[PDB]
Amino acid sequence: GTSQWLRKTVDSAAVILFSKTTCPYCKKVKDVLAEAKIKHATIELDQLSNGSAIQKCLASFSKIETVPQMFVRGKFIGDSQTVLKYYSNDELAGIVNESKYDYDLIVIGGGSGGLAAGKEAAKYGAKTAVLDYVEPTPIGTTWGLGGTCVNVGCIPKKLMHQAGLLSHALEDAEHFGWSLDRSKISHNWSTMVEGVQSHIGSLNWGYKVALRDNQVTYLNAKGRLISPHEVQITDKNQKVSTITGNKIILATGERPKYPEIPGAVEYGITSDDLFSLPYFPGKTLVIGASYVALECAGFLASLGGDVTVMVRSILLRGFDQQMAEKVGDYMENHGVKFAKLCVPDEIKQLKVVDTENNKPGLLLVKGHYTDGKKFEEEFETVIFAVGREPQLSKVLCETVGVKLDKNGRVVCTDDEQTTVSNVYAIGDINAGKPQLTPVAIQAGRYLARRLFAGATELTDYSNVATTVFTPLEYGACGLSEEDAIEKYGDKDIEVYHSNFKPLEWTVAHREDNVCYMKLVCRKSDNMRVLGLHVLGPNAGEITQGYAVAIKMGATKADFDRTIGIHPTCSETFTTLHVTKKSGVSPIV
Amino acid sequence: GTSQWLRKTVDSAAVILFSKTTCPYCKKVKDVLAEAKIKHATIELDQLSNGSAIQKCLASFSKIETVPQMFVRGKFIGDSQTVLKYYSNDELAGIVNESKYDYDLIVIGGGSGGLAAGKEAAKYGAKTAVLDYVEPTPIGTTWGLGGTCVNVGCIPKKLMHQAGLLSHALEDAEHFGWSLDRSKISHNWSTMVEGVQSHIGSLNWGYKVALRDNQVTYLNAKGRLISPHEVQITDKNQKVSTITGNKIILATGERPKYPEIPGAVEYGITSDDLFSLPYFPGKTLVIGASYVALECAGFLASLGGDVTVMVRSILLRGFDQQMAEKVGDYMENHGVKFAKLCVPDEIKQLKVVDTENNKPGLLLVKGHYTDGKKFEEEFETVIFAVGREPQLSKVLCETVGVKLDKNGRVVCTDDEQTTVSNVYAIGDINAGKPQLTPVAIQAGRYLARRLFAGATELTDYSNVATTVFTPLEYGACGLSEEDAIEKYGDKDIEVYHSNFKPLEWTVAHREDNVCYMKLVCRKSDNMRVLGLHVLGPNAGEITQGYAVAIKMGATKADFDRTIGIHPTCSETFTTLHVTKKSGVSPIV
Ligand SMILES: Cc1cc2nc3c(=O)[nH]c(=O)nc-3n(C[C@H](O)[C@H](O)[C@H](O)COP(=O)(O)OP(=O)(O)OC[C@H]3O[C@@H](n4cnc5c(N)ncnc54)[C@H](O)[C@@H]3O)c2cc1C
Ligand SMILES: Cc1cc2nc3c(=O)[nH]c(=O)nc-3n(C[C@H](O)[C@H](O)[C@H](O)COP(=O)(O)OP(=O)(O)OC[C@H]3O[C@@H](n4cnc5c(N)ncnc54)[C@H](O)[C@@H]3O)c2cc1C
Ligand SMILES: [Mg+2]
Ligand SMILES: [Mg+2]
Ligand SMILES: [Mg+2]
């Protein structure tokens, strides 16, 4: 184990120092490298249980067993006296910069995962390039550095969700004694978009500054992997060139799909366009039933819009379907209309978008229900939220040998390695992984540490918590009830559940028994918590801390012995007692 | 210890059935008791690991080793045929109601702990009385059933905190595109109090209905324990009588203290009066620096009031002082004035409260600072928040033998037992325990199960999470940093910390580096999390789930391997990396 780890670490690290924290010769070398502005990884052998074995194995590369030992790109450079010699003779800079490739790491994609990986690799002295290019949407929308979450995902969507939540805060404020009249207050879409876009612009700029400050080369260029170590880049002026890299990280993400029906690309939009749209969508049809579809429909309705969601089959496929039904029922009680069991056939244009008066156009949507009955209605905006897809055919030449699955995602080992030994993939394009921003970030950071700092820690993709930011939010960690029953059998599953009412909803005269939580547990394993589910305000804040406990193997007894914080919504997890098997009502 | 447990269980239970889930004879006995409206505890021997030894040890009472076996107040009643004989002969009701005392349980105090204990005991057939009486405040304020939290504590305070938080929501709404103008909106104190009090009234009524539905006798009477089994009650018409009970639970709580200075009782108020006050306090001085003092000052300022807090020494004594300073600094930047290192000497009346026109009076407060300088300022309302005290000299006759500590609280074992063996104490009067509503509720419920259902589970009072509902909320679980350093030494403590900015604060132009969190960890115990601290919105929702993980022994590695939910405040705990020892800034 140790010899294999050391060989892999030495071969892959850009600049690495084997050290001991007590040794003054090691401190002197560290001080020289810091003065020279040479970044590097450091392995403190006295801080590792197998450090003595590592010292012995180092002689297989350097012929010495002492510390310090400096390596650059697989080559032993020297001990203390030698490194000081190179520094004194002004030779060290050239040595640490010598490389077979232009870069130690090329990251293709400057989104959540790619920026995290590139910044982390640079900390260990890896010469790093991050490529990011945003192909415009069909109507021409484009945006800056940072990827989907920053520009057209989690960040703007949650800010618009907050704008929507504030509608109810205005209503509640009256009951709490404030003098406003909610019925005389209106919402200005353009003012909200300006504020959202100003924040996004600060993030775009902050990422460019962060790459500069980490000595990462940022290329606003489209990359294509043409062989294991060669990336062809096309710049803003269509100039084509090739750069080379030792390790390659594919982090190119996904883009929205469109249905293959007349008028969809021409006259509809997707989430990519929504978050910078200069005019309020107006009367809107959302086609689809993913979390993207429902989150966007929810905030548009809360802002005062006339919104309909066209659902082919079910809501939130892949999520617990009891929770999905409760999410949709709340939305329907709060203004969202649903066209159920329905698909679109064609979008016809009745009015062109009025860019001068800043108004949407008008569309005729024709569709049909599963029984064959026709759907026909006019909408000012049609938003397609019918899934997202990787677009690797343009990122990857087929001759490179990177295996893709049937959906076009990259088939990766548990350490993100593709079928090409120096090429890795992270984020939404890594087949089978949860498609979430903090997952991409952890994967990229942890991978960079394994490549360039000798780390061994893998990303754990199990029991990753989620939150759907619908008008009433839905947080979850672990299995749905139906997946738990499928895996273990109904007789081995116990479900504890309860309704609850936020204290803030009492004086506000809101609903008594809409918020809901459950714990899905395995009886034969000490009532292990297999899944946690909560519908209520601030559901992501509620869920997050429990994800640590679930990671640690929490049981129902662990929830019971923990004392609640009062008054909170979250504390209702600490006193659950009604089982579904008992048939006793969960109402409070 | 099976023999000792069975002896204690049979001796204490009111009505108890020993059964097996796999027995249709037990099913018949359960059905008969259910039809007879006879509530009882049930111990399913097949579900316990030592069930076989219990069956054998039951014969020491019943001379049989089969199930079912029924017991009443220490006496074996019979098997299947025998219980049916009594039922057929109309003898069973008399048998199950025979008792040496009027009640199996008398609970003195109808607050958080006492109501929880009384309701739980009644589930197992314990004939239960709950006594509750609310001695009026000096100005005459009184309230209904439910105790401090329901009437004059957590419930109204959090509702008034929410009214205060809505001030900032109104401001934020403008930046999110809503057309209101916060500067022309005002707050109506009386409207908010009316709504708060209507909710409280629904809780008072709900508790009365809950006791009725559980067959608990509710006496709105002042109780005094005059001997181990005798409680003297004084009813609303001053009629004095004595009732007897087998077990006694003392759950009488505490009341606000006043400083011993002229004018304090006559002209000041406390939290007991604030939550139903019919007029806005106006310009207000809060004397004290507890969480009660700061929570009330905070919401009064957010409602638009002119508020000053007079602090003898420090804020939030007993809490992490770095966090306390950050809490206070936020309040000072958001309208709360602080008179630091200052104590009051006298409250002088300048105008009497005008009850007819619903206006406060006017007071002159004289005090002095530690540097000798004088304090002299006028206020419309003076609120004392200088601690709370038990008042057991009127609850307990000294001859009973219940030992109190130097502060007047009850000295209890880890199972809530006093020095008188049938008398227990729960909630705020139990010396040394966290004085919180969910603690009182757990203690009461768990104690009732041990007394009347043979349970053995104790309440765990360690690492009980808290939240201070100041304008920026402060959640904590475990040790303060200073307590951890005192216990383990600075060299064995590592502190990970970060500022954060809620995404909701970006478009709203709120502060960049005021929200803050830290994990206080023990290096030599695998970086065990000793204390978690968070200052930010929704801090109780953030903190609660982590309390389960801390109960389970979470380490820093457990936080690191858990993935964040994005975008949330809570996810910041999953990526902490800056140590205090490193000196690196925690700013974003
Ligand atoms: C509407 C919406 C809401 C979401 N909400 C949440 C949420 O609340 N929480 C959450 O955790 N996740 C959320 N997500 C998911 C999250 O956005 C993604 O999981 C995350 O952005 C994936 O990161 P990534 O690094 O894999 O890819 P991306 O962030 O998509 O980055 C890939 C980047 O590479 C660029 N690129 C593509 N091809 C090339 C090429 N050939 N050369 C150069 N650059 C290229 C892309 O244009 C893009 O900039 C949401 C997504 C959407 C669409
Ligand atoms: C302003 C304030 C805010 C608080 N906020 C929170 C918070 O956010 N979260 C939290 O967890 N805790 C909070 N607390 C603490 C919480 O209120 C107490 O911990 C809890 O109420 C204690 O319950 P208890 O059963 O011990 O006593 P109590 O709830 O005080 O009940 C005791 C009852 O017994 C009655 N009684 C007294 N003597 C007699 C007698 N001789 N005969 C009959 N009846 C009698 C009393 O009048 C009262 O009704 C707060 C407290 C205050 C004062
Ligand atoms: Mg702005
Ligand atoms: Mg599942
Ligand atoms: Mg009302």
Automatic annotation (TrEMBL), chains A, B:
Provide the residue positions that the database annotates as binding Ca(2+) 1. Answer: D560, T562, T574
Which co-factor is required?
Answer: FAD
Recite the UniProt keywords alphabetically.
Calcium, Disulfide bond, Electron transport, FAD, Flavoprotein, Metal-binding, NAD, NADP, Nucleotide-binding, Oxidoreductase, Redox-active center, Selenocysteine, Transport
Q: Which residues form the FAD/NAD(P)-binding domain?
A: 103-444
| MF GO annotations | flavin adenine dinucleotide binding; glutathione-disulfide reductase (NADPH) activity; metal ion binding; thioredoxin-disulfide reductase (NADPH) activity
Q: Which PANTHER family match?
A: GLUTATHIONE REDUCTASE, THIOREDOXIN-DISULFIDE REDUCTASE
Q: What is this protein called?
A: thioredoxin-disulfide reductase (NADPH)
**Native organism:** Schistosoma mansoni
